[PDB]
Write a protein that binds this ligand. Sequence first.
Ligand SMILES: [Zn+2]
Ligand SMILES: [Zn+2]
Ligand SMILES: [Zn+2]
Length: 279
Amino acid sequence: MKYIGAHVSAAGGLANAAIRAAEIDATAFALFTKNQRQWRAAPLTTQTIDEFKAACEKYHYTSAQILPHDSYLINLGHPVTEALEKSRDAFIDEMQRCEQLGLSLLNFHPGSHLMQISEEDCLARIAESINIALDKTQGVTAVIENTAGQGSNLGFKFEHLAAIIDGVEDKSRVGVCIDTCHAFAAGYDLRTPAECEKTFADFARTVGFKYLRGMHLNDAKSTFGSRVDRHHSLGEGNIGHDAFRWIMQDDRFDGIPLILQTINPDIWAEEIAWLKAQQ
Ligand SMILES: [Zn+2]
Ligand SMILES: [Zn+2]
Ligand SMILES: [Zn+2]
């Protein structure tokens, strides 16, 4: 089985994310659990938590179908240690909100070296950040998202993901999410079925499908290897529709949230329906 949805809005409360997912016939969804703009969000209230759980139950979203995204302001590889510590505190808080909400996955971009430390040192800082969060929480898997590699962002090579995982002690609670736009922008081609297989064999040799915990299904406005992150609606960008059909027909992508972050929410229900029909 595949679980297919979108990163929907949590405006008016977290439970509305589940409602919005059901209104586009999603079988998965992503959301932010707080505003992306504060190192301290107010505590989740017992009512927010219960409304969210009640809506997930009403619309049949189990923990395995939901892929929250952390704030884009967190940098778990920050070269400045006081900033690193603020990002680690924020990340622990995000993981704890997932605990409270009954969520079992948390997707995040790994971090950025800001030209102040080496790639290896940054990746090690990121692995330690994950270890710290996993020591302070239970039941939530840290899902590392690949990136386009814009600026000093890491995680654009599959080897970066593997290097982080190698440094994580509790391998049972780390995994990865592959965003197709980010992969393409980083230089992993997806424009033909043969190129898709080549890219995913690379992923298999370097990371392995045992760590795959989510996908983000995005076409790309940016160009191949551009290292720019600009999504597009399915079929309208530089990747094209074939990659998405290929993914939908491959059983290695079963049982995990497959999340659109495409740029026109007015057509999400149609994109979800098209993806389901490609199976
Ligand atoms: Zn992301
Ligand atoms: Zn993404
Ligand atoms: Zn992106």
